[PDB]
Amino acid sequence: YFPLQSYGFRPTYGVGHQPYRVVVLSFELLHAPATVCGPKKSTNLVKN
Amino acid sequence: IDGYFKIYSKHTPIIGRDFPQGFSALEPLVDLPIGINITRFQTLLALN
Numbered sequence A: 001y002f003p004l005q006s007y008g009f010r011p012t013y014g015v016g017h018q019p020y021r022v023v024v025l026s027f028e029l030l031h032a033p034a035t036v037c038g039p040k041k042s043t044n045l046v047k048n
Numbered sequence B: 001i002d003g004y005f006k007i008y009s010k011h012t013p014i015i016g017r018d019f020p021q022g023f024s025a026l027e028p029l030v031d032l033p034i035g036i037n038i039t040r041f042q043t044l045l046a047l048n
């Protein structure tokens, strides 16, 4: 048997058979560097 | 240091011919989180 089978997505198919785009975001944290930080908020500057 | 490659540099004019007698500290120029093993290095020359 061929390992690869075509999905054959069609709009007329049901919700369970409609195409769904899936992205897995793995936040790997190797024990030395840090390159992906969060864009956290910055407030106003008040003096005196 | 700690996976950080730090490069400091300075551009001193020469008062004389070679190795002027004076003091000029090296300002930090770049810090790079490359985090790789460094044990040797080589320079590149330009040939005309």
Ligand SMILES: *[C@@H]1O[C@H](CO)[C@@H](O)[C@H](O)[C@H]1NC(C)=O
Pocket (backbone or CB within 6 Å): A032, B003, B035, B036, B037
């Ligand atoms: C290379 O660097 C890693 C950390 O990035 C360190 O654990 C390892 O011992 C180093 N290897 C050598 C051969 O110096």
